[PDB]
Amino acid sequence: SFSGYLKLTDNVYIKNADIVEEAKKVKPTVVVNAANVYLKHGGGVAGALNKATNNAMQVESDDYIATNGPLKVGGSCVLSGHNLAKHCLHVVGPNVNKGEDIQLLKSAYENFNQHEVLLAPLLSAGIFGADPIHSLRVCVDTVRTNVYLAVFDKNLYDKLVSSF
Ligand SMILES: O=C(O)[C@H](CC1CC1)Nc1ncnc2[nH]ccc12
């Protein structure tokens, strides 16, 4: 059900789209969230996905943290996708703005290999502070399963395609 994506490699496709709108239309098996270790979904992709679930994602996430404690930077957990997808894979890329190691970005993308097909954002981009060109390069060099990347900003999408 994914449509309008540009093919970058055998397994990586990209589109200029709002990942929330894309999840509502497609209802994928897995949507990836750009999470933090506490699963506090305040802003960016996490805030937008959570708002679209009417805060059900945050209620489920607070119960997960109360039981299990925080995730690691580079780690992930599988929770419900609520009204957006079957599952949500919450993946923690390093936040440069908070001083986290950029080498952990490859470990973060390795989580995608546990799922056959995913709708995802570029990890560590936006308010996480990493260079999005670098994030797309690490994605294409790490993920082996089928990943459909939604890039929100039009100008960034054009820059990523032309420089690939
Ligand atoms: O458009 C995106 O998909 C990302 C993440 C954002 C959607 C949460 N945006 C950006 N990422 C890196 N540098 C940027 N400069 C301006 C925008 C921008």
Swiss-Prot record:
UniProt domain Macro: residue ranges: 1-164
Superkingdom of this protein's organism: Viruses
Subcellular location: Host endoplasmic reticulum membrane
Membrane topology: Multi-pass membrane protein
Reported regulation of activity: Inhibited in vitro by GRL-0617.
Catalytic activity entry: Thiol-dependent hydrolysis of ester, thioester, amide, peptide and isopeptide bonds formed by the C-terminal Gly of ubiquitin (a 76-residue protein attached to proteins as an intracellular targeting signal)
The protein's role, per its UniProt record: Responsible for the cleavages located at the N-terminus of the replicase polyprotein. Participates together with nsp4 in the assembly of virally-induced cytoplasmic double-membrane vesicles necessary for viral replication. Antagonizes innate immune induction of type I interferon by blocking the phosphorylation, dimerization and subsequent nuclear translocation of host IRF3. Also prevents host NF-kappa-B signaling. In addition, PL-PRO possesses a deubiquitinating/deISGylating activity and processes both 'Lys-48'- and 'Lys-63'-linked polyubiquitin chains from cellular substrates.
Subunit: May form homohexamers. Interacts with N protein.
Full protein name: Papain-like protease nsp3
Organism this protein belongs to: Severe acute respiratory syndrome coronavirus 2 (2019-nCoV)
Residue span relative to the full protein: 1027 to 1190 of 7096
